[model samples]
Target: RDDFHWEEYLKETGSISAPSECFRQSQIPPVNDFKVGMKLEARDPRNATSVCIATVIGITGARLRLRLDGSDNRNDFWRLVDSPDIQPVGTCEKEGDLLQPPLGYQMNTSSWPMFLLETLNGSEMASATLFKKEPPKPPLNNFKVGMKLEAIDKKNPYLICPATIGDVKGDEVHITFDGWSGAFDYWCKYDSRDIFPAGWCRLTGDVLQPPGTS
Candidate 1:
């Protein structure tokens, strides 16, 4: 069949495998039960210290396309339902914390207090029971250049394809799509939920897109 061989590819490319510990993805990817229009709290990616109201504007596979309520439509972001960065709507207040305004909130920064109050007044919040607990993190960076894995193409969220580790730097790993040119390659945190281990799709019942020819 002239099928691909893991060992052959590694030898031909002179690549080293990233250890399993480098990935924080659960051995079994989390189940996704999110629905469009549901509201939840998410940590602002630009300012990790702040948590804000995010609405699920779209759903694709295990990811939710979220838009911060007080922010403009242009900065919508996608996150896996099981990501630690997102939680049920009342999570912050329940922890005795304040829900901060999203980065680039539309109204004048001074109006944030009133804005926060008004936003949740009648919002359809996602039920607390729907959130799956985030998977535990792997303790160390064990990734090495050339490891093979399954990774979501961020620009095309629905596709989970074969990928290789192009390079590894502290806290980040460069993902290069197998069989395609460098256009879809990107660098993400070593423990990013977007990256999954070998055979992840099969275990999670997610479709694994085939690698394309260059």
Candidate 2:
């Protein structure tokens, strides 16, 4: 049911599409080959410099909901399958790298070594082939006011909805969800991964919620 018509809607609303150059996404969105319960290595979001063991706890569109092995459940986070932050297990080891304990490791520091060993023992690690090469970042932000695109509703995280460029100031773009009021509006960097080119949902096989649909 790809019923929303951007060509007609653009004319109706007197707006325009955000040029693809304004976004950091790839011309063709990356494929999501991850599966739930597969183990992988991810740079800890809180401790960015450290690599940690993480599990694919959930898959939503092109994103994977990850939970660090030694971290508590409350700290789970999402990362796009092609995100530079994540990699297949053994990537660190193959390069003589070390896996550090996640920020707020649940067990005592002394238990980290054993915890790491047991966590990977007999686990189904995600295949290296499943990890796509990360797309290059656009050199600059070129968003313009009134440009239309799709963006994640941060409060709902999983929802991709129609949105407009409410304002553009240097590196920031104000996101106003189409047909939704001020509560869902917010400002973020032009290179923010949460924003996508129009038709991104259709191209990626993700469900695109219509305007005003909560």
Candidate 3:
């Protein structure tokens, strides 16, 4: 029954297997002991779901077997799920929600699905690559939670939004914007262009305070 649906779905979606004629499996490093429970994305050749979240189940030679999530069927398979897809799950969180979904439901509905699939299955897209004119780094070395600062709203490139340092996780800083709080939090590298000093609002002709900052 499972195999039947798999074939049926493929026929409906016109899904094709990753061409084996042009590709060959690469060797996983001997010392690279990717254990069970590790998160990754695997290509489901039997269906049109281009990418699915999978967990490593067994490691044999160069092949890393995986058990896919959310599937009703227990059909497990092995493949050279690229290192790009096999990422530390917490890496996304550590990056200050930098890879979060885009703004607005109606506007983003179409792209969000593909974005999620590619993000999980393909290589991790670096946050640094998104900016056109990266803002200057903030002067403050130590970022405490609730520290008020200035940063360019990446979503609204023209708006210089008032932000507070929400959290500091490893090498990244979590920042939240005023008024529009809870919606936006960007992960910034200590040296990246995502951060700016509190006074940047005055320089950019935007308000320095978040409604009432004295």
Candidate 4:
């Protein structure tokens, strides 16, 4: 039901010929252009998948057209994708190798197969339907870098690692553990139950200061 023709929509909205202010026209040189092989996140206009690595295929005027990988749907491609959705590719620690089984597994894994199959079928799914108007942003301004803080690592709830604020990227904060250095930039969703204010340390049996507190 969500499958309204994009081209038709563009025509009806008069966006087809309208000059988009999203990208500047004067800076349209190839040097200023994004290369074809570069990887960046894009909003899949028709699916629930909010972030996807899209490659630039061509640039025309102010539009940056792209093709998404790791998907079976070929007909769906992006045109004039906004700059806000395209972020420089960066690595995040893998949550896990295996898919976390859906809730209430006892009722049926059989239902899952059909649900997943239908979800991927493309007939019932529309990218615009699932497109997130605004992704959650990190609140790094609240805490300073290198400040020791008490946070619940959502991945390992049992261990309250002594962490230092590493870097602030947009809406995500990078937290580095004391013993672990390479495992840096672990992004915690701002609303996640694990991360908390410095005051939480005392209640959780974690000492407020490392040693020699004034």
- What is the TM-score of each predicted model, taking all chains together? 0.73, 0.84, 0.32, 0.31
Q: Tell me the alpha-carbon RMSD of every candidate.
A: 4.6, 2.7, 23.2, 21.0
Best by lDDT: 2
Please, what are the lDDT tens digits per residue for candidate 2 over residues 10-55? Answer: 8888889898778888887889988899999999988888999999
lDDT tens digits, residues 1-214, model 3?
1122323433553443222111121211222345655655444535532444556666543335566554433466653323333334445445454233322222344566665565457444223221122223344445566655556566644345556667777757776775575656687754443355544333333333332222
Among these predicted structures, which one has the highest TM-score? Answer: 2
Angstrom error at residue 193, model 4: 3.3
lDDT of each: 0.80, 0.87, 0.45, 0.40
Q: What is the lDDT of residue 26 in candidate 4?
A: 16
Runs with alpha carbons beyond 4 Å of true place in candidate 3: 1-141, 204-214
Candidate 2 vs 4: which has more lDDT: 2
Query: Candidate 4, TM-score vs. the true structure?
Result: 0.31
In the range 30-132, model 1's lDDT, one tens digit per residue, is 7888788888999997889999999999876667889998888887887877888899988899988999888879888889888877877787888877777
Ranking by lDDT: 2, 1, 3, 4
Each prediction's total of clashing residue pairs, residues at least 3 apart in sequence or on different chains, is: 0, 0, 0, 9
Backbone clashes in model 3 = 0
